[PDB]
Design a protein around this nucleic acid. Structure first.
Ligand SMILES: [K+]
Ligand SMILES: [K+]
Ligand SMILES: [K+]
Ligand SMILES: [K+]
Ligand SMILES: [K+]
Ligand SMILES: [K+]
Ligand SMILES: [K+]
Ligand SMILES: [K+]
Ligand SMILES: [K+]
Ligand SMILES: [K+]
Ligand SMILES: [K+]
Ligand SMILES: [K+]
Ligand SMILES: [K+]
Ligand SMILES: [K+]
Ligand SMILES: [K+]
Ligand SMILES: [K+]
Ligand SMILES: [K+]
Ligand SMILES: [K+]
Ligand SMILES: [K+]
Ligand SMILES: [K+]
Ligand SMILES: [K+]
Ligand SMILES: [K+]
Ligand SMILES: [K+]
Ligand SMILES: [K+]
Ligand SMILES: [K+]
Ligand SMILES: [K+]
Ligand SMILES: [K+]
Ligand SMILES: [K+]
Ligand SMILES: [K+]
Ligand SMILES: [K+]
Ligand SMILES: [K+]
Ligand SMILES: [K+]
Ligand SMILES: [K+]
Ligand SMILES: [K+]
Ligand SMILES: [Mg+2]
Ligand SMILES: [Mg+2]
Ligand SMILES: [Mg+2]
Ligand SMILES: [Mg+2]
Ligand SMILES: [Mg+2]
Ligand SMILES: [Mg+2]
Ligand SMILES: [Mg+2]
Ligand SMILES: [Mg+2]
Ligand SMILES: [Mg+2]
Lengths: 30, 148, 314, 178, 133
RNA sequence: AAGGGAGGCGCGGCCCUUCCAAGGCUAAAUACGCCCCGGGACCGAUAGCGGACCAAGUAGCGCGAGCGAACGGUGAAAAGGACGCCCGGCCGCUCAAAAGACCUGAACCCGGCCGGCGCCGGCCCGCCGGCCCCGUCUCGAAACACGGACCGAGGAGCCACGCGCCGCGGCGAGCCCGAGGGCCCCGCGGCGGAGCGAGCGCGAGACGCCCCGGGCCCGCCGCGCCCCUGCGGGCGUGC
């Protein structure tokens, strides 16, 4: 019997089609 | 690190710990939390009482800082006094020179009465008090005050 | 206990008190943990292109044509499988891999201090790899003032005794063994002394030398103190840096150095001391074990069990 | 063939060693294991076992609980194989001799300013390695919030709360609520 | 150690720079020592090679002194006189073994107006540097 | 319509707090391909872009919309093969070396010379003994169940986020490289610290090495009795 709290995270949107919803931080030292 | 993991100790074993009779298929139970009232009811009733249904009044917009309400116990009041003057306040217990503690300055509103206080008079200024907090303070000789 | 301070000539010219940061316990485990996280925080991301393998047009032919069911280009060529030539990766690499790691501030400081504590031992410096046979002291503090010519910097290093470490570094330059020499990492040199300076222009005289690194005393680098994640580096100290070390640790705010502890030498001494030996007590003697043999064989073997002789021998 | 199944059980695995990467822990363990080997003294035996625990089996002890526990035996040496923290809700601390793996800074200052002593386990192993006039003490192993959720909330004899957030009523208003 | 950040230390880019260089850069890349005597006279350490210079070769299997007959800038090499592949006939023509300009010291220089002037330009600039230092 | 709008539950009335719609302009801090510049614990010719090759969106295919390959490497130097003899071959020539249309040059398969006529075990060696075709689904496979002529190279649990538990490190009634500002220095929330109750709200000490149980305290639901500022306070009883 699994006793886990239910994850409350939303499903990813537009992962391969729409506007780019992934923001990276490789530029913050610059 | 990929080199210390369970999955690579299964090279040369065909199925990778998933079984020959059963196997590894896409979604043999459905996706997510579906089925909680039909074919997962044993799980949901064993581990999640009160997951289905409704309970109580609803508020269309809650005021977080109206409903905010910090609290302090009386077993903590003497630790807000710095360490280097409690010895003196305790030695010269005074009705005419008594320590005044204002707990809104430290960010508390109500004072509850868990614990006990040292035998020494003290004024405590808060915005609301509990009955036995008042009892214990007035029993050690302190005074409760209301602060703006 | 006080460290010595030598001239740019080799003679002994001053004494200076020990900084407290050398009394910290030696933690190879903590230095390894921090070295891993921080050296892993310097990486550049990499990934394949997101269109690779999927710009062509391919669909499965279905069953009934006596061929396997993968997608095929017009004409019949395999595509869109990790097992097809010219297909996509099964799980393409992506730049959203978490490249950095987090370390708490106390743990970082503790790693720096343990690396510095290791640096002050004549045994771990010799066991790390440097050449310390002709050095006066391992806490090595030399007053140099300003060195601007490599020739004078080499002169000081000779006059103190660090000349073989730099020659070890110089005569070890080679071309590395693998693919790495197509990717701007063609040569490898060994590592020698680390010079730490405070108020004194020295970088312009020391930098050219092979296997030498420069560090201003107010900002010390764990990746330089423990190269290879091995702690004991040989450090040439300026007088001012060695004298401002305690000021640096005082400038660290709401921070106290960790508590010093004992060593396995100290455990050994305690145990062999008399206050612990006075409470010992011998064990019972062990059993005596033989291999079974037939007593009835001969007379002495039987007479071990019954000497009277009532039992016949055979 | 031999029958070694009936009347015999599966053997047992326990920690014979600490798995800490800490040299101080490893050295104290080897030393006290030697002392046990050479003297007997179940005191040294229990101390050697306790130095192998897994840090959820080694809760903290506070100065106030220690003062209460050592009351009217104030002349004995308290031995704690864990950290000693401080309790600001106790205005006055008594004089005690405590030996512990670690002390907090505020706990050390309060103990010393009261007048008591702060010992290490090497100090203990030098002055007295077999525990004559020492008392072994430990904290509440079931004080963790994690151990308050073990079980089946929903079963009618549980007395254990569920894990996440549950906004409904079905099965949450007692018996005869399903 | 380099400090300037508009200059690559990348092997791919450096090798592609060495090939596909333009003619002026290639000509500058094909330089050689002056001998000690010309170093004293002109106070200059190196010059771009040219037809009409007399060159003394070492470090190779074709060692000798001769005049520069041809310049093969695509290959970065020079055809010197008298330094050939060993031929098969007793009659058949010579065929030059190509020498690389850094395997030589120039022994005697071809002079003209441009050569004179560029040398004096270079001396004055080296003098500016020597006055600064 | 005339004074009007809003105050996260509708309608009508009285207030309070706070703004002025139905017209307009405006820098900065923010985001980004093509092309240029620098870097990389990335790929190394079936990989990496479809495209590393003097002529790739090329050759080629489709009425058309459109589809779309394969092919990198002599040698330091072309020195890229003298002379002689037969009528393409042989000798030998350049070169360190033919590396001779080219680096190395495996397997599968084949031609000439030489030797002999499946695995395991004993013996020196052709005798004797044992041995069904693997992988798979299956109660059950040598199966007349399916896949597999041969060989090479490629070929399938990785990554991101969320949840639970366990281990280890640091500090501990506290803890914490947010963002940002000057591998170093400074840096808010937040989480923990008190719970229970639909809510108005009220609000925990008494015991205990540890664990388990008992008892008692806090809230929710009910009920004796006394009282001050009162459908409020105190003190008790019960699941
Ligand atoms: K499994
Ligand atoms: K199954
Ligand atoms: K399914
Ligand atoms: K499904
Ligand atoms: K779903
Ligand atoms: K459900
Ligand atoms: K309802
Ligand atoms: K496509
Ligand atoms: K197929
Ligand atoms: K198939
Ligand atoms: K391809
Ligand atoms: K920290
Ligand atoms: K650090
Ligand atoms: K290799
Ligand atoms: K639950
Ligand atoms: K050369
Ligand atoms: K309202
Ligand atoms: K609204
Ligand atoms: K409303
Ligand atoms: K291709
Ligand atoms: K099958
Ligand atoms: K089947
Ligand atoms: K079956
Ligand atoms: K079979
Ligand atoms: K079978
Ligand atoms: K059959
Ligand atoms: K058959
Ligand atoms: K058959
Ligand atoms: K079958
Ligand atoms: K069939
Ligand atoms: K089938
Ligand atoms: K078959
Ligand atoms: K953090
Ligand atoms: K209620
Ligand atoms: Mg198995
Ligand atoms: Mg299954
Ligand atoms: Mg149904
Ligand atoms: Mg197909
Ligand atoms: Mg590909
Ligand atoms: Mg390709
Ligand atoms: Mg070949
Ligand atoms: Mg077949
Ligand atoms: Mg393969």
């Amino acid at each position: 019997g699994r006793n886990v709290a239910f994850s409350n995270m939303r499903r990813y949107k537009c992962t391969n089609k729409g506007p780019n919803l992934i923001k990276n931080w490789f530029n913050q030292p610059a | 690190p990929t080199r210390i993991r369970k999955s690579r100790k299964r090279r040369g074993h065909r199925q990778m710990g998933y079984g020959r009779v059963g196997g590894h298929r896409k979604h043999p139970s459905g996706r997510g939390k579906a089925g909680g009232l039909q074919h997962k009811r044993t799980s949901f009733d064993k581990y999640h009482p009160g997951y289905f249904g409704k309970l109580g009044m609803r508020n269309y917009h809650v005021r977080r800082n109206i409903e905010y309400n910090p609290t302090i116990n009386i077993d903590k009041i003497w630790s807000l006094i710095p360490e280097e003057q409690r010895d003196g306040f305790l030695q010269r217990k005074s009705t005419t020179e008594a320590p005044v503690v204002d707990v809104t300055r430290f960010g508390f509103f109500k004072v509850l009465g868990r614990g006990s206080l040292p035998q020494c008079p003290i004024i405590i200024k808060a915005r609301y008090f509990s009955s036995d907090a008042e009892k214990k303070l007035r029993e050690v000789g302190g005074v409760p005050l209301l602060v703006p | 206990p006080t460290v010595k301070v030598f001239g740019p000539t080799g003679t002994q010219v001053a004494e200076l008190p020990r900084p407290k940061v050398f009394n910290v316990p030696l933690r190879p485990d903590i230095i390894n943990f921090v070295h891993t996280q921080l050296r892993k925080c310097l990486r550049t991301p990499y990934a394949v292109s997101r269109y690779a393998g999927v710009q062509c047009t391919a669909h499965s032919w279905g069953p009934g044509r006596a061929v396997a069911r993968l997608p095929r280009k017009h004409g019949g060529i395999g595509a869109y499988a990790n097992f097809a030539r010219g297909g996509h990766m099964a799980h393409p690499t992506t730049v959203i891999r978490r490249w950095c790691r987090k370390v708490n501030l106390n743990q970082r400081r503790y790693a720096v201090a343990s690396a510095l504590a290791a640096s002050a031992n004549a045994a771990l410096v010799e066991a790390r790899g440097h050449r310390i046979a002709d050095v006066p002291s391992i806490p090595l503090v030399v007053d140099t003032d300003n060195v601007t010519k490599t020739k004078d910097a080499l002169a000081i290093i000779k006059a103190v005794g660090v000349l073989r470490d730099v020659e070890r570094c110089k005569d070890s330059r080679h071309i590395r063994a693998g693919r790495g020499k197509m990717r701007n990492r063609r040569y490898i040199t060994r590592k020698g002394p680390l010079v730490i300076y405070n108020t004194e222009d020295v970088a312009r005289g020391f930098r050219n030398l092979p296997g030498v690194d420069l560090c201003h005393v107010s900002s010390i680098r764990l990746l330089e103190l423990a190269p290879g994640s091995h702690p004991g580096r040989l450090i040439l100290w300026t007088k001012s840096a060695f004298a401002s070390l305690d000021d640096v640790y005082a400038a660290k705010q709401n921070y106290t150095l960790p508590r010093s502890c004992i060593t396995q030498t100290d455990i050994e001494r305690i145990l062999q001391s008399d206050a612990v030996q006075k409470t010992f007590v011998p064990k019972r003697d062990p059993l005596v074990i033989e291999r079974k043999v037939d007593p009835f064989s001969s007379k002495e073997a039987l007479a071990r069990l019954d000497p009277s002789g009532t039992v016949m021998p055979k | 063939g031999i029958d070694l199944k009936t009347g015999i059980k599966k053997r047992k695995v326990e920690r014979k060693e600490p798995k800490s990467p800490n040299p101080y822990i490893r050295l104290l363990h080897n030393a006290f294991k030697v002392v046990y080997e050479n003297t007997g003294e179940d005191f040294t035996k229990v101390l050697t076992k306790r130095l192998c625990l897994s840090k959820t089996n080694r809760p903290v002890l506070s100065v106030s609980r220690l003062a209460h526990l050592m009351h009217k035996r104030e002349d004995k040496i308290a031995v704690v194989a864990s950290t000693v923290t401080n309790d600001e809700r106790l205005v006055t601390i008594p004089r005690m001799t405590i030996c512990a793996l670690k002390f907090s800074a505020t706990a050390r200052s309060r103990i010393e300013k009261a007048g008591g002593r702060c010992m290490s386990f090497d100090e203990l192993l030098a002055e007295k390695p077999t525990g004559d006039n020492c008392v072994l003490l430990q904290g509440r192993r079931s004080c963790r919030a994690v151990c308050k959720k073990f079980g089946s909330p929903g079963r009618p004899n549980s007395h254990v709360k569920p894990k996440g957030e549950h906004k409904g009523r079905r099965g949450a208003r007692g018996r005869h609520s399903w | 150690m380099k400090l300037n950040s508009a200059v690559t230390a990348s092997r791919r880019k450096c090798r592609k720079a060495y090939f596909t260089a333009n003619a002026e850069t290639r000509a500058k890349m094909m330089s050689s020592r002056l001998s000690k005597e010309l170093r004293a006279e002109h106070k200059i350490k190196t010059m771009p090679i040219r037809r009409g210079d007399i060159v003394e070769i070492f470090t190779g299997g074709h060692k000798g002194t001769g005049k520069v007959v041809e310049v093969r800038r695509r290959d970065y090499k020079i055809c010197v006189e008298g330094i050939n592949q060993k031929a098969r006939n007793p009659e058949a023509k010579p065929v030059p073994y190509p020498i690389h300009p850094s395997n030589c010291i120039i022994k005697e220089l071809y002079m003209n107006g441009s050569r004179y002037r560029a040398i004096k330009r270079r001396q004055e600039r080296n003098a500016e540097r020597l006055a600064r230092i």
